């Protein structure tokens, strides 16, 4: 009984992530996001322990639904004749990081440090749960404007984390690494680090560095805004053309530019309230 358990509100958005409606769980008035996905538009399918054939997105969301606030939490899901309905938590008030950067321009490095740090913790949580997001970008990051916490969303392009080469990709091309552009091959962790470099440049410069394939494989990062030497070095490290030259998550968080990060509450009070 999905119609009797939730009160469906206005449409929050639509696109590659299906159609997402605002909702309230009648049992406790908890704000939820109700995401509909058509079966005919599902690429990768998975199987739950019970053997039921569910979309891979449901499998990945369940594996990361540990309560860590850095990822969107799947609360429930339903199957319909031609679609799946996903019940997601809904923090309020929120704005995605794309709209945030569009309205504020390039972010102060103190704010970008706090945001980037939380994204790193969220991605570490995914990898620890065996999940590769494969579509890290500002559009897939929600900002809890009151708590100053970031949430990674839309696992619809993800996959189980493996140590062998990936040959499929359904994420965002301008965030994809040059080894995918050239050879249609990538490993999960080094590809994630590349997208994180694109994301970090996006935050401190106000837009992504590369729009065309030739720029992705070119290996030149021009800084259109004043960016500290420490931040520039971390970005260029993440955007190393050779995957093995890119830093690990530990090396990123140990980088001098990443030290003395603000707490989420401090981030909201200084930069969001």
């Amino acid at each position: 009984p999905l119609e009797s358990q939730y009160q469906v509100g206005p449409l929050l958005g639509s696109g590659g992530f299906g159609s997402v409606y605002s909702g309230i769980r009648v049992s406790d008035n908890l704000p939820v996001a109700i995401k509909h996905v058509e079966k005919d538009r599902i690429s990768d399918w998975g199987e739950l322990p019970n053997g039921t054939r569910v979309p891979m997105e449901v499998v990945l969301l369940k594996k990361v639904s540990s309560g860590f606030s850095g990822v969107i939490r799947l609360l429930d899901w339903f199957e319909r004749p031609d679609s799946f309905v996903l019940i997601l938590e809904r923090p309020e008030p929120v704005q995605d990081l794309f709209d945030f950067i569009t309205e504020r321009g390039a972010l102060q490095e103190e704010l970008a440090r706090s945001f980037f740090w939380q994204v790193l913790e969220a991605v570490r949580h995914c990898h620890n749960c065996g999940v590769l997001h494969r579509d890290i970008k500002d559009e897939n990051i929600l900002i809890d404007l009151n708590r100053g916490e970031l949430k990674l969303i839309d696992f619809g392009s993800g996959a189980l984390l493996k140590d062998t080469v990936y040959t499929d990709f359904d994420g965002t091309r301008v965030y994809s690494p040059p080894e995918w552009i050239r050879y249609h091959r990538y490993h999960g962790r080094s590809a994630a680090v590349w997208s994180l470099g694109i994301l970090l440049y996006d935050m401190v410069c106000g837009d992504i560095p590369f729009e065309h394939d030739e720029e992705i494989i070119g290996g030149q990062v021009f800084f259109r805004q004043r960016v500290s030497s420490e931040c520039q070095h971390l970005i260029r490290w993440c955007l190393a053309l050779r995957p093995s030259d890119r830093p690990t998550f530990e090396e990123i968080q140990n980088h001098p530019w990443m030290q003395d990060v603000l707490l989420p509450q401090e981030t909201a009070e200084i930069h969001l309230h």
Binding site: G15, S157, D170, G171, T172, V174, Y175, D207
Partner: peptide, 9 residues
């Protein structure tokens, strides 16, 4: 300079 979203896939 035109900043835009990029759909996935």
């Amino acid at each position: 300079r035109k900043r835009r979203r990029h759909p996935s896939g």
